[PDB]
């Protein structure tokens, strides 16, 4: 026999793959790319004013942030409809935008008494233990009174420099430009962004009723304690009113079928986890099954948790004069996409378990399997020198090059040098003598001396496997 | 093995013991070069725009209300070598120094 079981095991896998492919096709349309592109180009490409040539991406001073927040920002937000405000006469700006900042207090750090006679105040790096909570300025409204993270219904962000909190001093802008401009001018007249600020957030959302699909926007400007301006942005095309069309019902049915399939697989895996064999971890085709099941279970858990709580949208729809809070939904959508992509990638990789239909594929699979052990053995030795080079580059160049700034960047730039992409002219001025020595020795050693070992091992293993297979056939 | 491990521990302490200000130094130097308009200061090639340069972007920086605490007045230097030279033939410069 040995063929009736494999046929069922293959047809069920093909059905599951078809269902997953339909499901992943249904979630990735073509309008979202252009939607995001128009939003980004409207908000991140237009200059601050007609004379200045700096956009949001090239902010370089705290004065430039004030110049941007009145001008390009207000031009993008409020459009004179031929009251409400449609972004492109298509995208509706629902609610009102909100701006908030995080600041620290004076005397946070300690200047040495040797030079205390000239330095009066200091402000350390951002930290939860050393953030200001006292009122300042004219002291009327929420822009000058500290508000707890719990009352703001926010969460952390994990910015480039650090992980900011959700608290701070916030202010809800108006619904029309004539009042938002006045509010921003009032915030600028009194000193609201002094040396003590560390971050500033601007966020809003749009609907674009033509295609039922939201879009949340967040703009973050970071002020490090060492000076400078670090901008950031994020656009997320959410979708919260899913069940409108027939295709949406079809997608829901496909999701239910996928849940049934994953239940059947977990049942049939827990069935054979002990019956056919106990403690079978030497196959690598069953260690993949548990990964598939775990990833899919996590995906369904995230999906069922995210869509179960949409009370924010309803409570906004009761009264549309307040700021909608859609941060958590966007975060969970990003997490769900990240999980689903990996899940489908492993599902596609799983296909290798069945392509053994003839001698040509069987011998190739045998060659690939037999050469895994020594390749793994040599990979450790290769990566030891690779990480030694990475740490050398990080220590020597990791402060004046902008490309070796952190360890991950050193790893990635060495991988790119393996591809022969990165030029060497930006290292000699960083360091005159050790720069080109590093580049030359690294390319000399890793480029062919330690790189063709993989090819040699693979070639020798394949040749000897083929020779043995041919020899045993003739011996029989 | 014990001696090798002890030596590795010693060199790791020597090297990465203070490896927490490494990022801060990078951010500081990036902040300093961008503020002084490094790309603008390298763009000048004549000996007359230097003065408007350091008269509108350097003096407000070094001298200001708060203006990036200094710890020391700046200096200006010169060398003239007393063997004054003459202009070279036109075209590309003699990039070997004379």
């Amino acid at each position: 026999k040995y063929l009736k079981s494999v046929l069922r095991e293959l047809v069920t896998y093909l059905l599951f793959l078809i269902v997953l492919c339909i499901l992943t096709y249904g979630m990735m349309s073509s309008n979202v790319y252009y939607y995001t592109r128009m939003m980004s180009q409207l908000f991140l490409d237009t200059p601050v004013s007609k004379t200045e040539k700096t956009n949001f991406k090239t902010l370089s001073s705290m004065e430039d942030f004030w110049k941007f927040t009145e001008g390009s920002l207000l031009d993008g937000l409020y459009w004179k409809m031929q009251n409400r405000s449609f972004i492109f006469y298509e995208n509706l700006l629902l609610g009102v935008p909100r701006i908030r900042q995080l600041r620290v207090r004076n005397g946070s750090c300690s200047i040495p008494q040797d030079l205390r006679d000239e330095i009066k105040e200091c402000y350390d790096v951002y930290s939860v233990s050393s953030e200001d909570r006292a009122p300042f300025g004219p002291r009327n409204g929420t822009a000058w009174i500290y508000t707890s993270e719990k009352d703001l219904n926010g969460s952390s962000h994990w910015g480039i420099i650090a992980t900011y909190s959700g608290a701070g001093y916030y202010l809800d802008l108006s619904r029309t430009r004539e009042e938002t401009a006045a509010q921003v001018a009032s915030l600028k007249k009194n000193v609201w962004l002094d040396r003590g600020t560390r971050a500033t957030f601007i966020d809003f959302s749009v609907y674009n009723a033509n295609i039922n699909l939201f879009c949340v926007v967040r703009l973050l400007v970071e002020f490090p304690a060492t000076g400078g301006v670090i901008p950031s942005w994020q656009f997320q095309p959410l979708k919260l009113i899913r069940y409108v069309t027939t295709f949406d019902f079809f997608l829901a049915a496909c999701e239910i079928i996928f849940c049934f399939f994953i239940f059947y697989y977990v049942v049939e895996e827990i069935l054979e986890i002990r019956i056919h064999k106990l403690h079978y971890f030497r196959s690598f085709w069953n260690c993949l099954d548990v990964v598939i099941v775990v990833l899919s279970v996590v995906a369904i858990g995230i999906n069922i948790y995210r869509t179960s709580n949409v009370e924010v949208l309803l409570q906004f729809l009761e009264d549309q004069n307040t700021f909608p809070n859609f941060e958590h939904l966007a975060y969970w959508q990003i997490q769900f996409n990240n999980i689903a992509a990996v899940t489908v990638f492993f599902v596609w990789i799983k296909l290798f378990k069945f392509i053994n239909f003839n001698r040509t594929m069987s011998q190739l699979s045998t060659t690939m399997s037999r050469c895994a052990k020594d390749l793994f053995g040599f990979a450790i030795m290769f990566f030891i020198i690779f990480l030694a080079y990475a740490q050398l580059a990080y220590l020597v160049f990791g402060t004046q090059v902008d490309d070796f700034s952190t360890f991950q960047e050193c790893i990635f730039t060495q991988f790119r040098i393996i591809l022969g992409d990165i030029n060497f002219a930006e290292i000699e001025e960083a360091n005159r003598v050790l720069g080109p020595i590093y580049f030359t020795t690294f390319v000399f050693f890793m480029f062919f001396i330690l790189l063709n070992m993989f090819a040699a091992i693979i070639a020798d293993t394949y040749s000897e496997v083929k020779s043995d297979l041919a020899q045993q056939k003739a011996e029989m | 093995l014990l001696v090798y491990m002890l030596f590795l521990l010693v060199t790791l302490l020597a090297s990465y013991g203070d490896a927490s200000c490494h990022g801060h130094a990078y951010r500081l130097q990036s902040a300093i070069k961008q503020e002084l308009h490094s790309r603008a200061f390298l763009a000048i090639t004549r000996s007359e725009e230097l003065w408007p340069w350091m008269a509108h972007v350097l003096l407000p920086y070094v001298h200001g209300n708060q203006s990036s605490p200094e710890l020391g007045p700046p200096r200006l230097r010169q060398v003239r070598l007393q063997e004054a030279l003459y202009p070279d033939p036109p075209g590309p410069r003699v990039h070997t120094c004379s």
């Binding site: - | 521990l9 790791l12 013991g17």
Partner: peptide
């Protein structure tokens, strides 16, 4: 939330030398 690398390096070296030993 500041991290001190001294104790981490010391413990890592001790664990590695124990494993090899």
């Amino acid at each position: 939330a500041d991290v001190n690398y001294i104790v981490m390096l010391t413990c890592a070296v001790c664990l590695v030398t124990y494993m090899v030993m």
